[PDB]
C-alpha cells in the first residue's frame, strides 16, 4: 500500500493542452484535487515552478517513462503510485480532445481518476466508482466522490 507519509502535498502543471484556456485547465485540476481533499486529511498546494510532489503534464506517444501513449482515444492518461521522483506524477495524452463539457474527454473526470492513483488507490470493480477502469461521463457541476472511492481513500489515510 504505497501511501504519502505527508499530508500537505504540492503539485505543478508543467504544460498545457491548447484545447482549453489555461484557466480552465487549472480549474479542472484544482477541483479534481478538492474532491479527494474533502474525504481525507490531504491538503494540496499549487506551485508555479520548482520541484512539486506531483507533476502534471500533457505528453505525446513516447515521453520518457517506458509507457507511451497511443494516439486518440484508448489510453487517456496514467499516474504513478506515491513515491519520490516520478512517484505520484500524472501524465495525460496530449492527442486527446480535452473538454470542459459532456463531450469526450472531460479533463476534470479524467484528472480526478488519475489523482486517485497518485494517492495510492487501484482500479475498482464497482461500475459506479470513479476508480472504475473505463471512462464514463457523469455530471460535473457540484460533483462529489462516489461512496466506493471515499471508502477507498479512507482505508489508506483517514
Ligand atoms: C493503460 C490504459 C489501458 C489504462 C488507463 C488508466 O486507467 N489510467 O488511469 C486509461 O487511460 N484507461 C482509460 C480506459 C478508457 N478509455 O475507458 C480511461 O478512460 N481511464 C480513465 C477514467 C476511468 C474512469 C473514470 C474516469 N473519469 C476516467
Ligand atoms: Ca490515447
Ligand atoms: Ca513525484
Ligand atoms: Zn507517462
Ligand atoms: Zn486508471
UniProtKB/Swiss-Prot annotation:
Domain notes: The conserved cysteine present in the cysteine-switch motif binds the catalytic zinc ion, thus inhibiting the enzyme. The dissociation of the cysteine from the zinc ion upon the activation-peptide release activates the enzyme.
Name under which the protein is recorded: Neutrophil collagenase
Summary of the function given for this chain in its UniProt record: Can degrade fibrillar type I, II, and III collagens.
Record family assignment: Belongs to the peptidase M10A family.
Active site: 114
Expression (tissue specificity): Neutrophils.
Domain of life: Eukaryota
Record-listed Ca(2+) 2 binding positions: 70-71, 73, 75, 93, 96
Residues binding Zn(2+) 2, per UniProt: 113, 117, 123
Gene that encodes it: MMP8
Entire-sequence positions represented here: 105 to 262 of 467
Cellular localization per UniProt: Cytoplasmic granule; Secreted, Extracellular space, Extracellular matrix
Ligand binding (Ca(2+) 1): 53, 85, 87, 89
Binding locations of Zn(2+) 1: 63, 65, 78, 91
Glycan-linked positions: 8, 100, 142
Amino acid at each position: 500500500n504505497p501511501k504519502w507519509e505527508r499530508t500537505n502535498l504540492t503539485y505543478r502543471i508543467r504544460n498545457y493542452t491548447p484545447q482549453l484556456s489555461e484557466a480552465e485547465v487549472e480549474r479542472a485540476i484544482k477541483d479534481a484535487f478538492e474532491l479527494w481533499s474533502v474525504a481525507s486529511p490531504l491538503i494540496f498546494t499549487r506551485i508555479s515552478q520548482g520541484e512539486a510532489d506531483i507533476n502534471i503534464a500533457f505528453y505525446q506517444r513516447d515521453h520518457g517513462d517506458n509507457s507511451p501513449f497511443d494516439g486518440p482515444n484508448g489510453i487517456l492518461a496514467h499516474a504513478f503510485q506515491p513515491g519520490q521522483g516520478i512517484g505520484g506524477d500524472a501524465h495525460f495524452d496530449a492527442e486527446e480532445t480535452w473538454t470542459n463539457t459532456s463531450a469526450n474527454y472531460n479533463l476534470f473526470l479524467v484528472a480526478a481518476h488519475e489523482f486517485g492513483h497518485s494517492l495510492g488507490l487501484a482500479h475498482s470493480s464497482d461500475p459506479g466508482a470513479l476508480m472504475y477502469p473505463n471512462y464514463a461521463f457523469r455530471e460535473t457541476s457540484n460533483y462529489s466522490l462516489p461512496q466506493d472511492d471515499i471508502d477507498g481513500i479512507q482505508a489508506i489515510y483517514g
